Symmetry: D2
């Protein structure tokens, strides 16, 4: 939690341009908590209250919608505000090229609709999310894939037989819900282990073309920067072209 | 698990009438596992295989659908088989009048559609489910209530303000899903604590009449018997009119 | 269309209180078009622009959401604005006691969630909607009933067998969609003919208690006034206690 | 209706192999009516009753499910029977290479899930469906595209801006439902006019990769034959490699 907040405040302070940005994407993170918190803080500041009052915040589902309202920020919809200025969100893993695995919380669809509608997309995470090189290195649970519910047998068959997935499960709802997770868009989630992914761009397209697949947890050529919090208060940043700094 | 299986085998053996019953409701239990198992066993028996081959099993959602198929039983739909002969299911709590709290797994709607379509409804549970007297005694988490998603503020307001609920939460999906649980019928779940419920019949009607409420986890005048497993291998049975035996 | 607009402008002018009302319910009408239009006109007026700029308009689904935006009014959600000051909507039929049949457009659920969240509810219609006495007199197509999709056989059976409905059909989608209409809340619609309905309050409760029923198109003790347009430009008003005037 | 039935009976008689085929896909046609009818007729025949009794018929949504049951055929689900032997369905237009436009009834998703799960796919239509050359020649209403509901602005923007669509509309529900059609999979439908489509394979992939797109009405390299009924009782057949005959 320590690390999570560190990354978030730097991400907002360095990238949110009070002169340029009005439509802000707020993601489904447990790290974004501190993004919404930071933005909320600017609204409590007499210096920025007037400009921050006018920010319209676009959610990526229910926790996100909640984080916005609870921070007293204006809540908009992506349908009314389709051109987003800047979006902040978490990630389940980030690779050396700022390709992401997302969807650990089953909200990958609206996360991607928002992030790919944004001029700038910023990821905020704790340092464990930063892979030595490839997606699928430390996030071992699979690429989340949102699917039409009637297709779960077909999609599982295709992922195994055509795409050579190593492991494919329809995500179940645990103690909160018996049987399959249903998303905010009324879909199922498959978690598909592909091992370490060397060509995530190619992998995404292959999964996306499948009959039954709604969207993948692979976010490709989208994030412009990722901020990673350390417990020790420090923050590392990954940018495009393999450039990284503290 | 011990206790759970004990109750299940007696429930089936004593109540499933191979001469009379063809359409069988199979519930969303973690105790029903052993009901489907028991029924499956009769199908592996040369004596009963021919009759049990012809059973059509009606599920109460995805685990249930799964338990049926995995036990090699014929799978039907409630729409095609609306008159069910006998249904078996679990319960989160059972009172002295065989009124039930159900919905701990968020499948209360299809559980009730099936159980109230059945001539006979049998509950199978471990002994912890058997209340000293009232619903809400040992199940402290609230009556599950399935609601239209846009209504969660309204329904919460009505439950608190009109019905004097003690605690009202929209169930969240835990680590499997960020934000609210979505059911198999695309709805939300509210868990509403009403304390110990002295008139569950009255309570059910009041909740059911609310704008936003789809169905309640209160199963009223439905169960004809409940079987309760003890670890010690013993099985207690509650029947109508406060009659109970081993 | 003539008549429809007449009723709408009087309804708004006489009932929208610029001093008292800020949260306005806008219904799913083809007559409400002219309600949203009228409200929009006040926003184009330098006298009222500042006050009308601050109105927050709560939709009852997609046409409604559209009418609001296209009239340049602020769009809110019922979840964020649960206490509505005044709501305007259409009706498929109105009886002498201002009980309504609604749901001809399959939006009855969100229509009722909004209208019953409002301090004041005003109906706007053309004169054909005004029954000589009872609901079911000139609207012959049935009471719309929103139902959980898996329950359509059960609900039809109950409506016929328990409630003695005269005719029960699951509404089909016509040329736009093969098979059953699916609502904005992912439900089916049954249209149930009960003939002329002498006790709509009793009828509503009976349908609402059924397993599978989400909400009914019977709006009971909700509307405080109804405005009816004539082609001839005239407007008749029905109020509580059988009082009617031009 | 005349023409529609002609095509259907020949399609079944020539392609349904009572020795080889057990799992049969039944489509969402208004022409398939006569396919299900024909199959049903074989079940009324003492010669074929025993073999046809064992056919399991996989539906492509509600009319289809209905056609199966009403013809007394066994009803299965694609999840339980994922490998389909032969599927029959209609089409909104067929080109010279047996590429199809489908989705006029908003059931394109489950139609494609079924047809692409089949070893053999046969189209049955009246002669108006047979384009002189290209898709989009006589079907002028657009390629149906199933989309996640929150994405309708984004998808419309992408179709116009990236793919140069000529016309893009979110399909509305007509008199049966105010606002957007919702499909059996809880999605919206966009009808996108691309004019006459010279490379439907390329077009399908481009639309399918879009954020918000669930599935397209472009069925590519799927149909092995198409039967076209004439009023005059005659039937024309298109096969692979531009081969056509009566």
């Amino acid at each position: 939690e320590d690390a999570k907040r560190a990354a978030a405040y730097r991400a907002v302070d360095e990238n949110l341009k009070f002169d340029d940005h009005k439509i802000i994407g707020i993601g489904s993170g447990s790290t974004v908590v501190y993004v919404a918190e930071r933005i909320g803080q600017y609204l409590h500041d007499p210096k920025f209250y007037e400009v921050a009052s006018k920010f319209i915040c676009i959610p990526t589902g229910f926790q996100s919608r909640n984080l916005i309202l609870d921070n007293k920020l204006q809540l908009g919809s992506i349908e009314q505000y389709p051109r987003i200025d800047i979006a902040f969100d978490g990630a389940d893993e980030v690779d050396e090229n700022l390709q992401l695995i997302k969807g650990g919380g089953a909200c990958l669809f609206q996360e991607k609709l928002v992030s790919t509608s944004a001029k700038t997309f910023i990821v905020v995470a704790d340092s464990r999310k930063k892979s030595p090189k490839h997606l699928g290195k430390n996030w071992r649970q699979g690429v989340p894939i949102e699917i039409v519910p009637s297709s779960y047998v077909r999609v599982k068959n295709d992922l195994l037989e055509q795409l050579h997935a190593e492991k494919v499960d329809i995500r179940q709802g645990g103690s909160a819900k018996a049987g399959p997770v249903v998303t905010d868009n009324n879909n199922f989630i498959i978690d598909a282990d592909f091992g370490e992914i060397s060509d995530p761009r190619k992998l995404h397209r292959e999964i996306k073309l499948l009959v039954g697949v709604v969207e993948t947890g692979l976010f490709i050529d989208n994030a412009s920067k990722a901020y990673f919090g350390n417990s020790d208060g420090s923050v590392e940043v990954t940018e495009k072209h393999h450039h990284h700094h503290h």
